[PDB]
Amino acid sequence: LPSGSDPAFSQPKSVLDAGLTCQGASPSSVSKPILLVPGTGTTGPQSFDSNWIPLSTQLGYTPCWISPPPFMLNDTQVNTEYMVNAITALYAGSGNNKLPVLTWSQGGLVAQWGLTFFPSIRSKVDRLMAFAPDYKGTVLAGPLDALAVSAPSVWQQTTGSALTTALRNAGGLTQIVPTTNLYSATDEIVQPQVSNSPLDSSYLFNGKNVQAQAVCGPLFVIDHAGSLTSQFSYVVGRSALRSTTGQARSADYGITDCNPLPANDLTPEQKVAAAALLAPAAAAIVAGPKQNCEPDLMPYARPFAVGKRTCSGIVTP
Amino acid sequence: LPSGSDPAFSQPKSVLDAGLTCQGASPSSVSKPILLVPGTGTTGPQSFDSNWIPLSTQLGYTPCWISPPPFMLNDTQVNTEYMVNAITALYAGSGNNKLPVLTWSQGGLVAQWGLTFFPSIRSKVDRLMAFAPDYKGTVLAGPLDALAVSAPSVWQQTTGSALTTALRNAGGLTQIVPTTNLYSATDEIVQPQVSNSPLDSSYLFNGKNVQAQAVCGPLFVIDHAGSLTSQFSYVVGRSALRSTTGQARSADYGITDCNPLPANDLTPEQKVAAAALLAPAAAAIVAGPKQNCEPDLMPYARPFAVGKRTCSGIVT
Ligand SMILES: *[C@@H]1O[C@H](CO)[C@@H](O[C@@H]2O[C@H](CO)[C@@H](O)[C@H](O)[C@H]2NC(C)=O)[C@H](O)[C@H]1NC(C)=O
Ligand SMILES: *[C@@H]1O[C@H](CO)[C@@H](O[C@@H]2O[C@H](CO)[C@@H](O)[C@H](O)[C@H]2NC(C)=O)[C@H](O)[C@H]1NC(C)=O
Ligand SMILES: [Xe]
Ligand SMILES: [Xe]
Ligand SMILES: [Xe]
Ligand SMILES: [Xe]
Ligand SMILES: [Xe]
Ligand SMILES: [Xe]
């Protein structure tokens, strides 16, 4: 696990600040911030408007989010600069108090990538609550890569990629702060997830790894979006947020919570938007950047993926 | 469309017979057979054990398959001989009743090649259910081979080949029996497939052409193998086999069936094997025989590709 200096940002602070927003507040002065990190092909509001923005508010946080241009389709390493900058600002802006980080899809990857390579945030992040995170990426991105219709971060989120290799070799498949991972074997975007074991993309060693089917039964179905927005998700996320261990507790949820539909506390109109979460992401990925190779690893990550091939060639020792 | 007698087999009949196997039945006596034609780099069981062998069985058919050696990598015209022979056999052993044929990848091209050039089997094939068929071949060279160092059948499935030229010119890009073509814009082996229109390699004129994304939206992702194994592929497949017209019906599938993962009815172990269908197939292509030219068309196909080049040279 790297433990020296933070790598320098490739983006100016003014650029990284322009991608952070809080609801009803400036980040330099905010009460109880929760930082929300969005999925692939979405902004913060598109990922979280219909769910964790109002649900975290009702739990007493001030929701904050990053929206890395364009819609999280660019380099994951740069997306992480937005998060590291945001954590740093929210920590100070909230009286030097640690803050929770809550994520979906790529956002979990971005968060764990942050914790792995930017040691400074380790003492500023209270816990991690990750919904459907792809630490090992997904095999399903593969045919998109072969067709050269994959955005930079879609390449990076493909199993076997230089980036996911780098994360693994640096020790990032072990939790770095108290982490809860909620995911589903029936996730139609992120696979493999079927094992309820270290083989799963969403699994971290020593983490609170919650496969929906382990709680709700092997026949239970919940998809990629519902991993974030469901009633079941809410009860788990609330468990993780309220817990004094920093992880969700088994005693906090059970069979009566196993409802994959949008969380009960959402208004009917929010439920409609939540169910259709992936629609804006579909249009963004279709109109988004596409290339025929994986983006190069930043210098700090290269020693951990020697032999992998990116846009510029083989990563050398 | 070619009209006369069937062209003579280049292979002994007994060799072709041994390439046919039915699950639990002699070909001489089988109820409700369905013939499975496999993709490049596979045997019948390798293409279908994790999917349409058990899925057709639960639908009430007896699955039968052909396995032309070596792993469908040889001449597509010889691959076709196995299928023609198999159909003739299964038709008689089911009481002279027509039988459905269901195919993956090269399987569809083989099927349509047979229907185009072997007229005897037209009265014997009830319907064709082709998943990701490459009737136009593919424009994708791919990463498996050095360019123009490839298996016989890989040459033949390259867009612009003498064999795809011959198929088009013979009239074989029109459906010959009631045909359903299920395919995907996100097929990484066969392209073009993205337009939902006669531009796609899987499209047959008058056929029931089902491009998955046309029903499931642009980010519904199933690959060349997902085209065969997914829940949506199952639903469309089931419709085509049940339909009283021999083609899948739009009424039997819609948005709610849009699940890219392997068909629900498959066991957990089948789902794993089906999701992994491609890797060994690609490996047999990499590891297979290789040559620097497209095999020659048989005499029966040469008039339909005059000017194309093959191993012996230009077609006269
Ligand atoms: C998208 O990611 C690329 C690649 O990481 C970024 O390009 C780098 O940008 C920094 C600052 O402009 C430069 O100093 C680097 O030299 C660039 N590297 C390459 C390989 O291009 C780009 O800034 C990102 N774009 C957005 C909008 O975030
Ligand atoms: C692979 O295909 C080739 C070419 O179609 C087959 O070779 C022909 O076989 C017939 C019958 O033995 C001969 O009359 C021809 O002279 C052969 N032509 C050539 C170019 O070799 C071959 O039999 C096939 N191999 C297998 C194992 O199916
Ligand atoms: Xe996505
Ligand atoms: Xe984080
Ligand atoms: Xe994607
Ligand atoms: Xe999506
Ligand atoms: Xe056929
Ligand atoms: Xe060719």
Author numbering:
A (entry chain A): 1 to 317
B (entry chain B): 1 to 316
Wording from the paper:
Lipases (EC 3.1.1.3) are ubiquitous hydrolases for the carboxyl ester bond of water-insoluble substrates such as triacylglycerols, phospholipids, and other insoluble substrates, acting in aqueous as well as in low-water media. Among lipases, Candida antarctica lipase B (CALB) is the one that found the widest application in many industrial processes because of its high enantioselectivity, wide range of substrates, thermal stability, and stability in organic solvents. CALB belongs to the α/β hydrolase fold family with a conserved catalytic triad consisting of Ser, His, and Asp/Glu within an acyl binding pocket and a binding pocket for the moiety of secondary alcohols. CALB has two α-helixes surrounding the active site, namely α5 and α10 (14, 15), which have been shown to be very flexible regions and could work as a lipase lid by a relative motion between them either by increasing the working temperature or by working in organic solvents.
Pressurizing the crystal with xenon probed the tightness of the closed lipase conformation. Three xenon atoms, with anomalous signal bigger than 4σ, were located in monomer A in the catalytic site in close proximity to the catalytic triad. In particular, the three xenon atoms (8.3σ, 6.3σ, and 6σ map level, respectively, refined with fractional occupancies) in monomer A are located above His224, in the hydrophobic region of the catalytic site defined by Leu144, Val154, Ile189, Leu219, Val221, Ala281, Ala282, Ile285, and Leu287. No xenon atoms were observed in the active site of monomer B, thus confirming that the conformational rearrangement of the residue range 140–147 prevents the access of any substrate to the active site. Xenon is also found in the hydrophobic cavity defined by Met83, Val101, Leu115, Ile121, Val125, Val37, and Ile187 in both monomer A (10.2σ) and monomer B (10.5σ). A further site is found next to Trp155 in monomer B (7.2σ). The location of three xenon atoms in monomer A, in close proximity to the catalytic triad, and none in monomer B, confirms that the conformational rearrangement of α-helix 5 seals the active site. The unfolding of α-helix 5 results in the closing of the lid over the cavity, preventing the access of any substrate to the catalytic site, as shown by probing binding sites with xenon. Probing the crystals using xenon validated the open and closed conformations.
